[PDB]
């Protein structure tokens, strides 16, 4: 049920906001879909963390080059 | 073969994840391809255990306790309510309740938590 | 041991402890440190789970 | 915290029954939570105090 999926995404976003995870609704829904496909949650979290670290390093490099 | 389509969908979702988190919008960027390959490698060859629902629940309760101790009773209540709703909510692909996807999402949020006791 | 807490009774000192909340990145110790007081048995009727949570909240704050 | 704890201890020492002790300790704990901003009703006050503490920590750093 589309409403149940939307409620699940809103719950995930509210948890992220309480936890100040900085995840938007789309990224949360993508992570949920990937977990439903049987992706290991620790692996998914490690990938997300690595992508975040890479983005922070890129932004820091640009801010040192700007 | 359906295995290859499942792997391609996983790789697509991981590529979109890398795009969103790393900001690499251009798939021709070597950093984008590196992130996509790393994500697909981790998804196919992970050594992690399956998601433990009780562990996710315990992390949610620990964040609730943290907010309560920080006297942020509103943050504690919101965290607990949202995690319970998520664990009791159907996922976009999975209609069943309290599925491994729900506990995986809760585990992800707990790992992604940033000072939940001090957040508004 | 470095402060007057060492002079507290072992039955009191054994109940005073450091609790660490679930550690998140970016959190400081102020957000996760709390004192706790374990209440059980008949004393748990007066020092209920709500009472213990309130005491721990005041301690952490 | 200290005043509500002393009130709890005095009430327990003055308690006439187990239910009276439980109620007096619960009331003391609720008073401590409210005055330490740890109760449900003081949550806005607790949030303002937490923001003050966070700004104090930022200033300290």
UniProtKB/Swiss-Prot annotation, chain A:
Is Cytoplasm there in the keyword field?
Answer: yes
List the keywords (alphabetical).
Acetylation, Cytoplasm, Cytoskeleton
Biological processes per GO annotation: gamma-tubulin complex localization; microtubule nucleation by interphase microtubule organizing center; mitotic spindle assembly
First-listed, main subcellular location of the protein, grouped into a coarse class: cytoplasm
Keyword Acetylation found: yes
Subcellular location(s): the record lists:
Cytoplasm, Cytoskeleton, Microtubule organizing center, Centrosome; Cytoplasm, Cytoskeleton, Spindle
Any Gene Ontology CC annotation: centrosome
On assembly, the entry states: Associates with the gamma-tubulin ring complex (gTuRC) consisting of TUBGCP2, TUBGCP3, TUBGCP4, TUBGCP5 and TUBGCP6 and gamma-tubulin TUBG1 or TUBG2; within the complex, interacts with TUBGCP3 and TUBGCP6 to form a luminal bridge with actin that stabilizes the initial structure during complex assembly. Interacts with TUBG1.
As for what it does, the entry says: Required for the recruitment and the assembly of the gamma-tubulin ring complex (gTuRC) at the centrosome. The gTuRC regulates the minus-end nucleation of alpha-beta tubulin heterodimers that grow into microtubule protafilaments, a critical step in centrosome duplication and spindle formation.
The record's comment on protein family reads:
Belongs to the MOZART1 family.
Tell me the protein's name.
Mitotic-spindle organizing protein 1
Q: Organism source for this protein?
A: Homo sapiens
**Whole-protein residues included:** 17 to 82 of 82
From Swiss-Prot, chain B:
The record describes its quaternary structure and partners as: Component of the gamma-tubulin ring complex (gTuRC) consisting of TUBGCP2, TUBGCP3, TUBGCP4, TUBGCP5 and TUBGCP6 and gamma-tubulin TUBG1 or TUBG2. TUBGCP2, TUBGCP3, TUBGCP4, TUBGCP5 and TUBGCP6 assemble in a 5:5:2:1:1 stoichiometry; each is associated with a gamma-tubulin, thereby arranging 14 gamma-tubulins in a helical manner. Gamma-tubulin at the first position is blocked by TUBGCP3 at the last position, allowing 13 protafilaments to grow into a microtubule.
Q: Which family does it belong to?
A: Belongs to the TUBGCP family.
Q: Could you tell me what this protein is called?
A: Gamma-tubulin complex component 5
Counting on the full-length protein, the chain here runs from 6 to 125 of 1024
Compartment(s) where it occurs, according to its Swiss-Prot or TrEMBL record: Cytoplasm, Cytoskeleton, Microtubule organizing center, Centrosome
Say which domain of life the source belongs to.
Eukaryota
Q: What does this protein do?
A: Component of the gamma-tubulin ring complex (gTuRC) which mediates microtubule nucleation. The gTuRC regulates the minus-end nucleation of alpha-beta tubulin heterodimers that grow into microtubule protafilaments, a critical step in centrosome duplication and spindle formation.
Tissue spec: Widely expressed, with highest levels in heart and skeletal muscle and moderate levels in brain.
Curated annotation (Swiss-Prot), chain D:
User: What's the domain of life for this entry?
Assistant: Eukaryota
Let me know which tissues express this protein, per UniProt. Answer: Ubiquitously expressed.
* Intracellular or extracellular location(s): Cytoplasm, Cytoskeleton, Microtubule organizing center, Centrosome
**Member of which family?**
Belongs to the TUBGCP family.
Q: What does this protein do, in the record's words?
A: Component of the gamma-tubulin ring complex (gTuRC) which mediates microtubule nucleation. The gTuRC regulates the minus-end nucleation of alpha-beta tubulin heterodimers that grow into microtubule protafilaments, a critical step in centrosome duplication and spindle formation.
| Self-association and partners | Component of the gamma-tubulin ring complex (gTuRC) consisting of TUBGCP2, TUBGCP3, TUBGCP4, TUBGCP5 and TUBGCP6 and gamma-tubulin TUBG1 or TUBG2. TUBGCP2, TUBGCP3, TUBGCP4, TUBGCP5 and TUBGCP6 assemble in a 5:5:2:1:1 stoichiometry; each is associated with a gamma-tubulin, thereby arranging 14 gamma-tubulins in a helical manner. Gamma-tubulin at the first position is blocked by TUBGCP3 at the last position, allowing 13 protafilaments to grow into a microtubule.
- Protein name, as recorded: Gamma-tubulin complex component 3
Gene (name only): TUBGCP3
